[PDB]
Amino acid sequence: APRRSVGELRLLFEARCAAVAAAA
Amino acid sequence: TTALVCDNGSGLVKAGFAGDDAPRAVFPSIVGRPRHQGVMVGMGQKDSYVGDEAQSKRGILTLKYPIEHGIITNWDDMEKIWHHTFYNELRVAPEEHPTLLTEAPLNPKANREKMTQIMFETFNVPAMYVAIQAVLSLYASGRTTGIVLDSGDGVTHNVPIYEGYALPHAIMRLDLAGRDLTDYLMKILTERGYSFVTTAEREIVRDIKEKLCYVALDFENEMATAASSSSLEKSYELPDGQVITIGNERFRCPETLFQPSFIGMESAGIHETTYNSIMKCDIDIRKDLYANNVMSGGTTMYPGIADRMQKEITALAPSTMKIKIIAPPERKYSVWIGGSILASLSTFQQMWITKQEYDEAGPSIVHRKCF
Amino acid sequence: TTALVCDNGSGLVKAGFAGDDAPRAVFPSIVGRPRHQGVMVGMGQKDSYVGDEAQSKRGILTLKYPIEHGIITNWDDMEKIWHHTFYNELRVAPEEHPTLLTEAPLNPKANREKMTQIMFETFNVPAMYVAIQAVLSLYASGRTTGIVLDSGDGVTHNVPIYEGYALPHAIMRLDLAGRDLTDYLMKILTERGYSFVTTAEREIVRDIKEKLCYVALDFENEMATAASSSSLEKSYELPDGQVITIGNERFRCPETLFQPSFIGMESAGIHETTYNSIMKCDIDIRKDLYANNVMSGGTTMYPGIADRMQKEITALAPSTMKIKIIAPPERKYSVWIGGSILASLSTFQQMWITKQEYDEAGPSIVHRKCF
Amino acid sequence: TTALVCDNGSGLVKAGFAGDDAPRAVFPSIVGRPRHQGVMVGMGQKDSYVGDEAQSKRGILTLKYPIEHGIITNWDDMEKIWHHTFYNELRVAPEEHPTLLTEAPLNPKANREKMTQIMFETFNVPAMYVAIQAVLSLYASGRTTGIVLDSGDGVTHNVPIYEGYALPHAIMRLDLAGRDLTDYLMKILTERGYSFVTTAEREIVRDIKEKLCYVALDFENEMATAASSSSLEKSYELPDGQVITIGNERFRCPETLFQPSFIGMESAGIHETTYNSIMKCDIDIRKDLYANNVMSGGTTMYPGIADRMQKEITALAPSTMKIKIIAPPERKYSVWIGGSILASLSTFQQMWITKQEYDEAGPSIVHRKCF
Amino acid sequence: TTALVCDNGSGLVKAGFAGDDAPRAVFPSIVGRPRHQGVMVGMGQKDSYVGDEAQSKRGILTLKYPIEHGIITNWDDMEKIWHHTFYNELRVAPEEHPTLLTEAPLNPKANREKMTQIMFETFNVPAMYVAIQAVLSLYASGRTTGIVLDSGDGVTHNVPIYEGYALPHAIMRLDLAGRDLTDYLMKILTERGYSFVTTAEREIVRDIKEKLCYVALDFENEMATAASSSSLEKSYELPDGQVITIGNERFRCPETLFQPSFIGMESAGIHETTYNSIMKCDIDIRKDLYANNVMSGGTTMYPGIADRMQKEITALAPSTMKIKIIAPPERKYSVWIGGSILASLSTFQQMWITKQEYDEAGPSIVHRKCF
Amino acid sequence: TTALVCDNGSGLVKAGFAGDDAPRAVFPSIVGRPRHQGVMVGMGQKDSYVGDEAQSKRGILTLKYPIEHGIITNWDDMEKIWHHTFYNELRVAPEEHPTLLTEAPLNPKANREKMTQIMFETFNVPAMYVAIQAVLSLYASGRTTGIVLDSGDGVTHNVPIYEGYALPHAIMRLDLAGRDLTDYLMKILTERGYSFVTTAEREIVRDIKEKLCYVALDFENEMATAASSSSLEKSYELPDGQVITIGNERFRCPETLFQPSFIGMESAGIHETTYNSIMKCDIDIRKDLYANNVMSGGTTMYPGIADRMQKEITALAPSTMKIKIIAPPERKYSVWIGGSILASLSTFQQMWITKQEYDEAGPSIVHRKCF
Ligand SMILES: Nc1ncnc2c1ncn2[C@@H]1O[C@H](COP(=O)(O)OP(=O)(O)O)[C@@H](O)[C@H]1O
Ligand SMILES: Nc1ncnc2c1ncn2[C@@H]1O[C@H](COP(=O)(O)OP(=O)(O)O)[C@@H](O)[C@H]1O
Ligand SMILES: Nc1ncnc2c1ncn2[C@@H]1O[C@H](COP(=O)(O)OP(=O)(O)O)[C@@H](O)[C@H]1O
Ligand SMILES: Nc1ncnc2c1ncn2[C@@H]1O[C@H](COP(=O)(O)OP(=O)(O)O)[C@@H](O)[C@H]1O
Ligand SMILES: Nc1ncnc2c1ncn2[C@@H]1O[C@H](COP(=O)(O)OP(=O)(O)O)[C@@H](O)[C@H]1O
Ligand SMILES: [Mg+2]
Ligand SMILES: [Mg+2]
Ligand SMILES: [Mg+2]
Ligand SMILES: [Mg+2]
Ligand SMILES: [Mg+2]
């Protein structure tokens, strides 16, 4: 599998936390 | 101000600013003190050497590790390692940079407290946190669900996680890692007469371990092949140019992870403790833990360890389960990369231990806030 | 505006617009709250899971049912289940849609009152009604006359009806249903060591009950056959791929409907309470009740339950009586289909509790208008 | 011939002749096998050690318990424990002595069958019986009515009884007992760095648990007192003379009986499961169960457990009920004393499984005769 | 035929028949070859002298030891030492006598293999075995349990044992022994000008070491006493009648066992490596190792070494532990006496490597059978 | 006041002020006393002559060296040599100039004490120090790390050093140097009849050694070449004009450094003792010792000695090691130049033994402070 940067991984957890904050 | 991530694991310090892709200071967590007389004046002959300084002077220093089995045993020297990390390697004043430390789970609360005392009163850092290394290793892999297997220099531990929600009763820690592998490699290299006994030689056998060793896929058949043919033998050149040759020791060394009884350790192997950790989890989530084994830490770098681990868990786990192991490249740095993510995450800025909270609550605060 | 039918029975919510042939939202009446320490970022902002989400996260949640034995025990969570039903599943604002609720008979008037308060003051619904589930179950069959046997997750009840004119003295309610069957199945699966104890495991034994169990036609001879041969054994695969095998438990579980003493329940069985309900009816109508036993509710779905019920009542009832059981397909949804009929019947538009009547008369109004 | 009573509970075997006041053989239900090399010839170096033999050699043996959660997992070693019990400890030939075994309720029928097979075909015993441990625990108190709480090494179970007539639907079994307390004590002793990991160390932490631990009367206030002052700390001396000191761990360990969520167990606590067991009973008899709580099993020996249990049930039960707990001295041996009564009761001599009945009916007989 | 025991340790051969109380051939493991011209014909002037021959001719021979640090470095001369042992000293044909060899632990497998090849193909011996010297040292004491500390001419090693079952992970070997003590004694005797440089003079300083040296009980105070007064000085007479006088060198020499840094050896002292060996053992057995320290080998003969060792371990070990040292008379011969026991033990006659097994399996057999 | 450096080595005194580039007094360490009658009055005929005085009168004096094998044997004459050094050669009053003496390592402490007594009580010098000659020899090269090979008139010694930190256990001293070369040259010049027997003739053969001798690169082939052809023969003219001719003696003389057995010395050669000294060092530093062999002392001045030493160590050392020899010009004076550096180094002014310290502590002080 290819690498992904810390920027992209941060964007994953940002998007997930936004998703749960909208679900909350 | 940009946060600071300092993975004081055992054996190697990994440190660097948060948001960087890789730790810009990686050096051994060693303090060395001159072993011999001080014959030659006109030099500082300084009392102590740390990190690459100590490696560059290895053969005249009594090397010591101040963190042992993930436990800091020697705070006077660990405070030297932190001083070196901040002022000499990262070249930064910690009183401007909130520092994300990390430690292994199931670890004496005195350590987390003394780290807190030292960070807030010696280094005056604005804020601090102490994440569990295995939780960071999920951040570095973009997961929210999985078992993490971290296997360091001093400790190995399993932490299962499911959409968050680490299962604290299913955590396991083994106290078997790269130092026990180095010392067993020294013990078996004694079987053909390469006597290594000094800590400098321990530090050379660590290099022999990293360069030559690999994990056998089928230990009995690899042992029989090494007995029947020299094809598995490899030659290595010591710092003085003495060649050594190594054979079944090459895979007998890391095999002790799967067969701890080789070092007299009673515990179940790392595959068995991985399975037993999944078996402590609720039966609904086990299928996703099997589908999300994450491997991290330097002693997971052995060639074939992912294949052997997959074979062994596929033999342990029910035949339907899709046993999958996420053992990427740079999994050696995944704990730091996970700290670099977490410390730079927008929502984590609530989580810091502020110095006001330390002035209000003393070392006890870090049991209340940190997991 | 098209009316709305929301069968808040136990175990499953069935909801959908009136005039539809089938409920477009069917999901478990479960609220689940996290059981474990939330270590990662990206959780805990959401702290309560409802319905299919609670099933998708089953193994980290303390699942709870807020309606128990047809009685709503936990209004704070039931109001969450209604919120989820209207806004997330049906995606509709209740203040435009008059809502036909339904409940079991012989049920605390505090429930019908609190449902009224919640519907008119939390959800502002234009109008509301609370039909008896068994009366609804006739409409889905097209009968005007019959015994209805409703057997849900939490309660089982018999309501005889003749051209209208439900006989309120002959209504019977048993408090024995699919939860007591699930818990007894767990107790007997313990007899060969499948220890299920968590609510996640209770929710798996519910699936085992639905997939494998059936009602024996002749319990003593089926028990002897399962004792003499393995032909009745079936294998099932747990969420982690562990296979289990089940034998006489497969029909001993639903047999407790006919022999409540298996769970220590004192009462007569469901065949006996059906017969005794017909025996409470006036002697002229009994022949048409025997000719019109209607079965409804999910726990009437067991294979062979209609055959066993017909055998047992034909043994109870006089030899001339043409004992007939109307146990159609979709009888699991017949209470909702009956509500979908009734709410769209033009004669019924007189019957709604209007919000003006609630503003005039408070919760007490729903005892005056509704049966 | 005088009957024989052999309480193969978990953790400790209690065995002795019927009519004796106390078991004359009490020893741990452990089989240990040599862990290390066999360097020193001129000795038997025998393959296996059991009971006090294994304790006397603890630090060179891999100790194992062949009965786990009240379930015999390892019949090859359990048959060694029975052989040791009969021939080495009691020094008696079982072919003359009918043996009253006992086991926990809600337990796999394969166990009761294999115990029957082993007793009648390996030990040729003239007759056998398998009483429920909680039913035995009444006889040692002299009650005919009560809710027995047995809390062993492997399982804890509640059995309400009224003039006889155990209520089988109200029986509850928890799978939480002294082994889970030992393992949690090891996990929390890790919090200040007493790393116990071997089974020998597990067997030392069992002793620490027995010597030091107690049940807090008011856990929050005891925890605050242990946080504010060292007065609750006690020192203990390990087999090598290393002193350890223990504080809030001293009552946090047995508190997990009342708060199983500490070990991640979802179930209600032992006070709540006692109350729920009384709540499964018919409402007339509950007052006499409240008046006759009987405590038995070694994990009921903690100081203050009766006071805490009485406080918690008095908070659960209605204010009028005279909550009384019968937790006498020797309640650790009450199951054996109850067997010593029952096996010597003249009414019981009808109840034995004779070997003729086993030759006629195979292992299946012990489900027909025994409760 | 009566077995034969030949302790080819370093420095001295001890050899004799099994069952004898003491080795009937004790002589130095030296080969000497003429250093000078061959001026005087009419004599054999033979090419080589061994043992007492070489000592009787010491000052014209280049003495060499063919076994160095317990490792045989010079097989061509070791085969001369074995030839001398069998044919000249014991005056016996090895083809009738099964020979128990012995070697130190953690020793190159090439040595044990070449010893096997030489015994079975040069000396045709009927059978052979290679016991660990420390395991033999228990038999001479009659213990079954203990740490053994063997301290020879070339190596020092610790082996803990418990009822059998040597703990192989806790074995330690130091490579510091009587030769390093002799060479350090030469280095410090140079401090007052007794220049010893030839191997003949090394062999005289070995005698000075044996006659005069002792181990200080409190090294700092003995050093201060030797500095303040001549009372500790002793005079010795060299082979040519030159008197020498010796002072603080008398205890500074054997002190290097406790302070290896005097010879630049980094390792912990023999008391510290004894304690660390006990600390590698499981915590249950440590009390019996403390109660059973066995000392063996010639360099344990120094006056006061048992007192110093007891003081140092009592300072290391926990205050309760009954530190006891079994340092009997004849502990110099205890390894041979242990071999004389073992080789004559009737249980051991199974253990011999027969020549048939060597013809079947070659030198590799001696890793499979022998420990 | 400017310090004073006085290298009382054997054979030649080198003395001069610190900070000078070269010793301004170099003269032989000889005392000569008239051998014959005092026939001719009218002259002082003085009792003793030293240095160039003794050389100018060589043939009527019994020349003696008061320092032999680096040991001062004759303090009454050595005090004359120091008197001559200060008052006649350097023409300076020692009571103003702190004097850096130096001596070989592994040398009787009585010498260092008597030198201290003489300097502080005969010459009243303000301060004194006694550096190891090989440590001084590094300063003249500018190294901090290296083997030093010092080869004087009386002693040869190896001292390995690494960034400082001389390894005292790896120091070796050979007692073979230019006097043994002179005496062997006299013995082999006897083979063609140049009988030299007086000390005056010994002093002429020292000149023959310095002028003619060289070290063969390949001794066997040079010996064969000198046997086959006269091309290697050289002619020399004695003080009386008698011509002598010399052949294979020309390189057989200094070959004895590499083959001490020529003079019956048993020790390994200077190449072998250099290698064995590196082999006493820890394996990490050996590569820098191989890269930094420093040669010093007059007997390293032979043509080709660096080439022969490099060949021999490259044959001894592992094939990869970059064997390098730092044998510069003026390496005869490098010990003095190193003292001229050290005595004028500002860091060293802490290190002097002050006369106050001698008045407090006597001769014993120079073992405590000086290395
Ligand atoms: N490529 C490799 N192969 C085998 N072992 C390695 C490799 N790289 C590092 N190691 C070992 O892993 C350990 C260091 O792992 P690391 O993750 O830095 O420790 P920690 O988890 O405490 O930070 C050391 O024992 C080192 O020898
Ligand atoms: N095919 C089936 N076989 C057996 N049991 C079933 C089946 N389908 C549903 N059930 C059980 O019936 C119950 C749900 O019935 P349902 O009619 O939805 O409840 P309610 O009457 O409260 O709406 C659950 O206990 C479920 O396990
Ligand atoms: N005084 C005590 N205090 C606390 N725990 C005890 C005490 N005595 C025994 N135990 C624990 O109780 C368990 C043994 O109980 P026991 O009744 O013998 O088991 P079983 O019910 O299987 O026979 C062990 O875990 C033991 O550690
Ligand atoms: N009485 C004594 N005092 C001190 N040292 C001794 C004494 N006797 C022997 N030694 C030393 O012990 C060494 C020999 O020990 P030994 O046990 O024979 O060696 P090994 O263990 O190899 O057989 C020699 O170095 C010898 O000088
Ligand atoms: N060019 C040379 N060739 C050979 N030998 C020399 C040479 N110069 C001096 N020597 C010898 O070296 C010795 C003097 O060395 P020196 O370094 O002055 O002694 P020290 O080391 O005691 O000061 C004398 O034996 C002298 O003969
Ligand atoms: Mg790490
Ligand atoms: Mg329903
Ligand atoms: Mg019990
Ligand atoms: Mg020996
Ligand atoms: Mg010199």
Picking from B103, B252, B111, the residue whose alpha carbon sits closest to that of residue B173 is B103
Picking from C112, C124, C118, C90, the residue whose alpha carbon sits closest to that of residue C17 is C90
Picking from D126, D283, D261, D78, the residue whose alpha carbon sits closest to that of residue D180 is D261
Q: How far apart are CA C179 and CA C271, in angstroms?
A: 19
Contact C35 D106 (CB under 8 A): no
Picking from D228, D340, D298, D283, the residue whose alpha carbon sits closest to that of residue D28 is D298
Could you give the 3-state DSSP secondary structure of residue F129? strand
Q: How far apart are CA C52 and CA F87, in angstroms?
A: 109
Backbone angles phi, psi at D153, to 5 degrees: -85, -35
B347 touches chain A (CB under 8 A): yes
Query: In whole angstroms, how far apart are CA B259 and each of B214, B309, C334, D13, E4?
Result: 15, 12, 61, 33, 39
Could you give the 3-state DSSP secondary structure of residue F38? coil
User: Helical H runs in chain F?
Assistant: 52-56, 75-83, 109-121, 133-141, 178-189, 199-212, 219-228, 249-255, 270-280, 286-290, 305-316, 334-344, 355-361, 365-368
Q: Helices then strands (H, E): number in chain E?
A: 14, 18
Tokens of D222: 């005891």
What are the b/e assignments for D39-68, b being 16+ CB within 10 Å? bbbeeeeeeebbbebbbebbbbbbbbbbbe
Query: In whole angstroms, how far apart are CA E206 and each of D249, D349, E175, E212, F257?
Result: 59, 85, 18, 10, 28
Backbone angles phi, psi at C305, to 5 degrees: -65, -35
CB E300 within 8 A of CB E334: no
SS (H, E, C) D302-363: CCCHHHHHHHHHHHHCCCCCCCCEECCCCCCCHHHHHHHHHHHCHHHHHCCEEHHHHHHHHH
C11 touches ligand 2 (CB under 6 Å): yes
Fold of the E4-132+335-368 domain: Nucleotidyltransferase; domain 5 (3.30.420)
Tokens of B342: 């977490």
F contact test, residue of B41, B197, B202 with most F CBs within 10 A:
B41
CB B323 within 8 A of CB B286: no
Q: How far apart are CA B158 and CA B268, in angstroms?
A: 13
Rounded (10°) angle between helices F270-280 and F305-316: 50
Strand duo E31-34 + E61-64: pairing: antiparallel
- Burial status of residue B230 (CB atoms within 10 A of its CB: 0-12, 13-18, 19 or more): exposed
B contact test, residue of A3, A9, A16 with most B CBs within 10 A:
A9
Contacts by E193-199 with C-beta closer than 8 Å and gap 24+?
E193/F71, E193/F108, E193/F110, E194/E244, E195/F69, E195/F175, E197/F175, E197/F266, E197/F267, E198/F266, E199/E62, E199/E63, E199/E64, E199/F266
In DSSP notation, C224-263 reads HHHHH-GGG-EEEE-TTS-EEEESTHHHHHHHTTT-GGGG
Q: Compute chain E's Rg from CA coordinates.
A: 21
Query: In whole angstroms, how far apart are CA E170 and each of B184, B255, F156?
Result: 12, 19, 45
Q: How far apart are CA E54 and CA E200, in angstroms?
A: 10
Tokens of F347: 């860091």
- Give the H or E element holding residue D131: strand D127-132
SS (H, E, C) chain B: CCCEEEECCCCEEEEEECCCCCCCEEEECCEEEECCCCCCCCCCCCCCEECHHHHHCHHHEEEECCEECCEECCHHHHHHHHHHHHHHHCCCCHHHCCEEEEECCCCCHHHHHHHHHHHHHHCCCCEEEEEEHHHHHHHHCCCCEEEEEEECCCCEEEEEEECCCECCCCCEECCCCHHHHHHHHHHHHHHHCCCCCCHHHHHHHHHHHHHHCCCCCCHHHHHHHHHHCHHHCEEEECCCCCEEEECCHHHHHHHCCCCHHHHCCCCCCHHHHHHHHHHHCCCCCHHHHHCCEEEECHHHCCCCHHHHHHHHHHHHCCCCCCCCEECCCCCCCHHHHHHHHHHHCHHHHHCCEEHHHHHHHHHHHHHHCCC
Contact D242 E347 (CB under 8 A): no
When CB atoms are compared, the residue of B71, B169, B267 closest to D197 is B267
What are the b/e assignments for E263-276, b being 16+ CB within 10 Å? bbbebbbbbebbbe
Discontinuities in chain A with C to N beyond 2.5 Å fall right after: none
For chain D, the farthest-separated pair of C-alpha atoms sits apart, in whole angstroms, at 72
Q: How far apart are CA F252 and CA F244, in angstroms?
A: 17
Which residue's entry shows tokens 């919000």? Answer: C355
- Give the H or E element holding residue D276: helix D270-280
Which residue's entry shows tokens 């393959």? Answer: D47
**Among protein residues, the one whose CA lies closest to atom 13 of ligand 1:** B153
Alpha-carbon distance C318 to nearest alpha carbon in chain D (angstroms): 35
DSSP F133: H
| Cβ contacts of E183 within 8 Å, gap of 6 or more | E202, E263
Contact D39 E317 (CB under 8 A): no
Q: How far apart are CA E118 and CA E363, in angstroms?
A: 10
Rounded (10°) angle between helices F133-141 and F334-344: 80
Strand duo C293-296 + C146-151: pairing: parallel
Strand duo C172-173 + C156-161: pairing: antiparallel
Q: How far apart are CA E210 and CA E302, in angstroms?
A: 8
- Burial status of residue E242 (CB atoms within 10 A of its CB: 0-12, 13-18, 19 or more): exposed
DSSP C37: B
CB B15 within 8 A of CB B99: no
Chains that touch B (3 or more CB pairs under 8 A): A, C, D, E, F
Query: In whole angstroms, how far apart are CA E178 and each of D136, D185, E254, E297?
Result: 70, 49, 9, 10
Tokens of F242: 């008698």
Alpha-carbon distance F266 to nearest alpha carbon in chain E (angstroms): 6
Q: How far apart are CA C104 and CA F226, in angstroms?
A: 127
Q: How far apart are CA E245 and CA C138, in angstroms?
A: 123
CB C229 within 8 A of CB C223: no
Q: How far apart are CA E270 and CA E3, in angstroms?
A: 34
| Cβ contacts of C56 within 8 Å, gap of 6 or more | none
Which residue's entry shows tokens 């296996």? Answer: D48
- Give the H or E element holding residue C161: strand C156-161
E contact test, residue of B35, B62, B176, B197 with most E CBs within 10 A:
B197
Contact A13 C46 (CB under 8 A): no
| Other CB atoms within 10 A of residue F144 CB | 17
Q: How far apart are CA B164 and CA C43, in angstroms?
A: 7
CB D362 within 8 A of CB D156: no
Picking from B331, B367, B352, the residue whose alpha carbon sits closest to that of residue B133 is B331
End-to-end CA distance of chain A: 33
Tokens of C39: 């270590």
CATH 3.90.640.10 region(s) of chain F? 178-255
Architecture field, domain D4-38+47-133+335-368: 2-Layer Sandwich (3.30)
Picking from E269, B58, C172, B251, the residue whose alpha carbon sits closest to that of residue F163 is B58
Q: How far apart are CA C292 and CA C296, in angstroms?
A: 13
DSSP C163: S
| Cβ contacts of F48 within 8 Å, gap of 6 or more | F31, F32, F33, F77, F80
Q: How far apart are CA D364 and CA D362, in angstroms?
A: 5
Which residues, judged by CB distance below 6 Å to any ligand atom, belong to the binding site of ligand 3?
A: D 7, 9-12, 152-154, 178, 206, 209-210, 297-299, 301-302, 332
B vs F, Cβ pairs < 8 A, gives 84
Contact C39 B371 (CB under 8 A): yes
DSSP F364: G
| Other CB atoms within 10 A of residue B360 CB | 9
Q: How far apart are CA E240 and CA E259, in angstroms?
A: 34
Discontinuities in chain F with C to N beyond 2.5 Å fall right after: none
All residues of chain B having their beta carbon less than 8 Å from the beta carbon of residue C46 are: none
Beta bridge partners of E33: E62
Could you give the 3-state DSSP secondary structure of residue D80? helix
For the CA of D7, the nearest ligand: 3
Backbone angles phi, psi at C64, to 5 degrees: -140, 145
Q: How far apart are CA B255 and CA B181, in angstroms?
A: 9
CB C296 within 8 A of CB C149: yes
Q: How far apart are CA D104 and CA F335, in angstroms?
A: 91
Beta bridge partners of F172: F158
Contact B340 A14 (CB under 8 A): no
| Side chain identity at residue C190, one-letter code | T
Q: How far apart are CA D325 and CA D310, in angstroms?
A: 7
Per the entry, the structure determination technique was cryo-EM
Picking from B190, D39, D240, D46, the residue whose alpha carbon sits closest to that of residue E137 is D39
Tell which atom from ligand 2 comes closest to the C-alpha of C207.
27
Contact E266 B197 (CB under 8 A): yes
Q: Which of the following CATH numbers is that of domain B142-175+269-326: 3.40.50.300, 3.30.1020.10, 3.30.420.40, 3.30.930.10?
A: 3.30.420.40
| Cβ contacts of C192 within 8 Å, gap of 6 or more | D108, D109, D110
- Burial status of residue C353 (CB atoms within 10 A of its CB: 0-12, 13-18, 19 or more): buried
DSSP E89: I
| Other CB atoms within 10 A of residue C4 CB | 26
Could you give the 3-state DSSP secondary structure of residue C89? helix
When CB atoms are compared, the residue of F110, F167, F175 closest to E192 is F110
CB E74 within 8 A of CB E82: no
Distance of CA E133 to the CA centre of its chain: 9
CB C160 within 8 A of CB C167: yes
Q: How far apart are CA B330 and CA B341, in angstroms?
A: 15
Q: How far apart are CA D306 and CA D295, in angstroms?
A: 8
Q: Compute chain F's Rg from CA coordinates.
A: 21
Say how many Å lie between the CA of residue E338 and the centre of ligand 9.
11
CATH superfamily of this structure's domain E138-175+268-326: ATPase, nucleotide binding domain (3.30.420.40)
End-to-end CA distance of chain C: 25
Query: In whole angstroms, how far apart are CA F41 and each of B89, F45, F49?
Result: 84, 8, 18
- CATH 3.30.420.40 fits domain F139-175+269-326: yes
Q: How far apart are CA C126 and CA C116, in angstroms?
A: 12
Architecture field, domain C138-176+268-326: 2-Layer Sandwich (3.30)
Beta bridge partners of D50: D31
Indicate the class that CATH gives domain E178-255.
Answer: alpha beta
Q: How far apart are CA C333 and CA C273, in angstroms?
A: 23
Q: How far apart are CA D209 and CA D237, in angstroms?
A: 13
- Burial status of residue F351 (CB atoms within 10 A of its CB: 0-12, 13-18, 19 or more): middle
- Side-chain-side CA neighbours of F68 within 13 Å: the count stands at 8
CATH 3.30.420.40 region(s) of chain F? 4-132+335-368, 139-175+269-326
Beta bridge partners of C246: C234
Fold of the B4-29+65-132+335-368 domain: Nucleotidyltransferase; domain 5 (3.30.420)
Query: In whole angstroms, how far apart are CA D39 and each of B261, E158, F297?
Result: 16, 15, 59
**Resolution at which this structure was determined, Å:** 3.2
Q: How far apart are CA D129 and CA D107, in angstroms?
A: 15
Q: How far apart are CA F120 and CA F137, in angstroms?
A: 26
Q: What residues are neighbours of ligand 10 (ion), with CB under 5 Å?
A: F 9, 152, 335
What are the b/e assignments for B146-184, b being 16+ CB within 10 Å? bbbbbbbbbbbbbbbbbbbbbbbbbbbbbbbbbbbbbbb
Strand duo E293-296 + E243-246: pairing: unpaired
Tokens of F284: 């990490």
Picking from B292, B273, B289, B293, the residue whose alpha carbon sits closest to that of residue B281 is B289
Picking from C255, B31, E191, E282, the residue whose alpha carbon sits closest to that of residue D195 is E282
- Give the H or E element holding residue E338: helix E334-344
Q: Compute chain A's Rg from CA coordinates.
A: 11
